[PDB]
Amino acid sequence: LQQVFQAPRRPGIGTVGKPIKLLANYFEVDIPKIDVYHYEVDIKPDKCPRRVNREVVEYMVQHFKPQIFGDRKPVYDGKKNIYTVTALPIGNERVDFEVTIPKDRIFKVSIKWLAIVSWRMLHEALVSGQIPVPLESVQALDVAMRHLASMRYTPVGRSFFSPPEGYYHPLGGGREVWFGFHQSVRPAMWKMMLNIDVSATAFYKAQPVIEFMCEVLDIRNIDEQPKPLTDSQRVRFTKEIKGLKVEVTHCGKRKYRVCNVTRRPASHQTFPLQLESGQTVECTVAQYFKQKYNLQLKYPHLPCLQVGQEQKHTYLPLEVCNIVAGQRCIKKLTDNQTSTMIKATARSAPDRQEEISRLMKNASYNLDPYIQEFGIKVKDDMTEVTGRVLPAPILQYGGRNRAIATPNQGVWDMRGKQFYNGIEIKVWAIACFAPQKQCREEVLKNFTDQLRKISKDAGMPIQGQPCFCKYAQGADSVEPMFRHLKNTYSGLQLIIVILPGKTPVYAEVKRVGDTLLGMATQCVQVKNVVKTSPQTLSNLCLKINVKLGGINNILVPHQRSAVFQQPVIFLGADVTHPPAKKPSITAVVGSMDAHPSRYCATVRVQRPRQEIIEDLSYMVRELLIQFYKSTRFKPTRIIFYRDGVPEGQLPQILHYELLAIRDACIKLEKDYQPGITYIVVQKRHHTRLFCADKNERIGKSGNIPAGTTVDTNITHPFEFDFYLCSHAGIQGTSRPSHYYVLWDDNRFTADELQILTYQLCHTYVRCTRSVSIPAPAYYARLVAFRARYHLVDKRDPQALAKAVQVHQDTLRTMYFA
RNA sequence: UGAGGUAGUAUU
């Protein structure tokens, strides 16, 4: 795509904030100012795994030196791209015919010159900043520096993993944790940077399929009371093993991919087998394995794996199959597996810092023969960078004392403070979906008493007892009760729903409440009803007040950016994709006052895995319209925070979405052209920042302080990007959010935009804490997540779209809080 | 589902 909208240059660096010395997991890379030669490699067959492509090229490099490669050490991306330090002695296009040994594998390979890539030009961009960074030069460098690791380890995205050795972290259900590292090369001022971080992801364990089945179905002993799998067990087992690769053990080692699991057991599952007589008969898998391999199945009552093409009949008894090693788990982990993995992978900032250092020392990048071939040198120590801790905004509260809150280390509380605009709760009801013996009437009364007191101190007075309180069982009971409530109790403001933990009832409560009836609901776990704490109750009130149209607090007005001198709307946008049928979900929220405090939400479904927000123009138009309704002001500026996108698609996302925002404005009025600031906020990266002075480490996790900002040294050489760690680190190693200013009509300075971004992280209503991303971005995530619950069903795109449309009386509410 | 933070989140 011809990039029409060029990203704005960095207008300057920030000067505001207390200086803090930091170390970054970015290591300086020195490159020679030379030409690098780019060749295209065409392999047939062309749909082999990258691993196989690498084996093919490695064979060629070793067997074709006097002809082609000489003493050069080429680097290869496992696909189309090969690089060498000097030109290959070829005119144009050489075709090869090789027999790589395992059955024998024959490949047809052709190689031709594609381009000359200049690393001098790359250097000149990094030092001057008067030319665009040559991406083709960066790619060549990236391929050279990860070539060896790609041969040694198992690549996963931009990371590398290897089988566990000296450690073992089973997750259950046939999954385990592999440790490894991320590696990427990134342009910075003066020099390229090698970004290295430790990493850990889920892999399927290399074990017999039988044992894999027993973990998935939670079977302690396959030999205790042996019996066929129930229909539920089969489907459950099938969903886990379908798509996975298995290997057989009855032939001394062929691999297959599982396409299905037979309903019939091995004793009865048949297939057409041609005998020596020429006659074809329906032979069972058990009979076949007995006659062919003299194998007596120990578990003929168990199903078979169907492998290869579904159209044909290749069945494998479970007991002759192993799960193939090295298969990454793309499927979602259970709540239990998630907890176990987080536990085994949690690393404090000082510990991660040491692991990265240790990795770099042991890696010996300067002893990599391919790195040496290309005359590349890597600095041993982490890049030093002086960050700045931005000042936190003061928050204004209400009540008769009108207290202010001053954040300390990214945190404040409501002690002695009342909501800026607190709602009085006259009419409210309680629906208890936890059983009576689990949540007695006496427990209910104590909960509501403690809640009414906390709410009174917070300036959200709950008058009297609930108008209605009753027990109920099952999600089927939600709609009848809710409809009854809406029709019986006039002026009903809130339903408090007590839940027995994880239950389908929650999704139904939100469906009926948000989309069907348009009624405010607040769910609470029964454990938090039985054991009440002022802190939990206080946090509950934060959500309730906002859901009922209140304002918890505001930024002190005179300590904000000058953009507030004119009507300005803040947008947050997010896209969530379905786990590894279901659609992708897009969400855009928009501020509805000048604080900015209250937000309205829009949400859509679209094609699975599509990153671009397809309906953005319509969504923005709705928000602009609602903004005008609420404020009677036409926004002169639009500040758009877009939650993370893959950087490989970033120029495409900006192009179409910036057009869509502009499109929305013009369709409202022909000459309506408000100033647009488009900011991408990213958490899914591997940039790590550590306190250089170990005494400045905060808490047990020992992370950098909230407000720590970096816009030098490791950032883009001329574009407008910065890291801001807005949150207190209380768990593992903090991820500083990365902000990329892709467009700015509004002439923001670095300080102004960095501070504005920080302040927005203090406007998030769910907690009195500075959060890791601006509230509009966070709100957008919550809206998309809520839509997923709305989509829960107990088909066609049109029905899916209707399922996420909230009720009329919900459209102008913060139901997502 | 009080809340934030965080590992990960493409032959038979």
Curated annotation (Swiss-Prot):
Residue ranges annotated for the Piwi domain, each copy included: 494-792
Positions of the UniProt region annotated as Interaction with guide RNA: 288-293, 501-543, 684-688, 727-735, 764-789
Outcome of mutating residue 197 to V: In NEDLBAS; uncertain significance
Record note on what altering residue 727 to L does: In NEDLBAS; uncertain significance
Disulphide bonds in the chain: none
Main location: cytoplasm
Subcellular location: Cytoplasm, P-body
Location of the region described as Impairs access of bound RNA to the active site in the Swiss-Prot/TrEMBL record: 646-651
Outcome (variant: residue 781 to H): Does not confer enzyme activity by itself. Confers modest RNA cleavage activity
The entry's keywords: Cytoplasm, Disease variant, Epilepsy, Intellectual disability, Repressor, Ribonucleoprotein, RNA-binding, RNA-mediated gene silencing, Transcription, Transcription regulation, Translation regulation, Ubl conjugation
Signal peptide: none
Start and end residues of each PAZ domain: 208-325
A single cellular component GO annotation: nucleoplasm
Stored InterPro entries: ArgoL1 (IPR014811), ArgoL2 (IPR032472), Argonaute_Mid_dom (IPR032473), Argonaute_N (IPR032474), PAZ_dom (IPR003100), PAZ_dom_sf (IPR036085), Piwi (IPR003165), Piwi_ago-like (IPR045246)
Post-translational modification comment from the UniProt entry: Ubiquitinated on surface-exposed lysines by a SCF-like E3 ubiquitin-protein ligase complex containing ZSWIM8 during target-directed microRNA degradation (TDMD), a process that mediates degradation of microRNAs (miRNAs). Ubiquitination by the SCF-like E3 ubiquitin-protein ligase complex containing ZSWIM8 leads to its subsequent degradation, thereby exposing miRNAs for degradation. ZSWIM8 recognizes and binds AGO1 when it is engaged with a TDMD target.
Outcome of substituting residue 303 to L: In NEDLBAS; uncertain significance
Domain of life: Eukaryota
Molecular functions (GO terms): core promoter sequence-specific DNA binding; double-stranded RNA binding; miRNA binding; RNA binding; RNA polymerase II cis-regulatory region sequence-specific DNA binding; RNA polymerase II complex binding; single-stranded RNA binding
Pfam families (UniProt xref): ArgoL1, ArgoL2, ArgoMid, ArgoN, PAZ, Piwi
Disease: Neurodevelopmental disorder with language delay and behavioral abnormalities, with or without seizures: An autosomal dominant neurodevelopmental disorder characterized by global developmental delay with intellectual disability of varying severity, speech and motor delay, and behavioral abnormalities, including autistic features. About half of patients develop seizures.
Role summary: Required for RNA-mediated gene silencing (RNAi). Binds to short RNAs such as microRNAs (miRNAs) or short interfering RNAs (siRNAs), and represses the translation of mRNAs which are complementary to them. Lacks endonuclease activity and does not appear to cleave target mRNAs. Also required for transcriptional gene silencing (TGS) of promoter regions which are complementary to bound short antigene RNAs (agRNAs).
Subunit structure: Interacts with DDB1, DDX5, DDX6, DHX30, DHX36, DDX47, DICER1, AGO2, ELAVL1, HNRNPF, IGF2BP1, ILF3, IMP8, MATR3, MOV10, PABPC1, PRMT5, RBM4, SART3, TNRC6B, UPF1 and YBX1. Associates with polysomes and messenger ribonucleoproteins (mNRPs). Interacts with LIMD1, WTIP and AJUBA. Interacts with APOBEC3F, APOBEC3G and APOBEC3H.
Family the UniProt entry places it in: Belongs to the argonaute family. Ago subfamily.
Record-linked PANTHER family: EUKARYOTIC TRANSLATION INITIATION FACTOR 2C
Protein name: Protein argonaute-1
Record organism: Homo sapiens (Human)
Phylogenetic lineage: Eukaryota, Metazoa, Chordata, Craniata, Vertebrata
Gene name of the encoded protein: AGO1
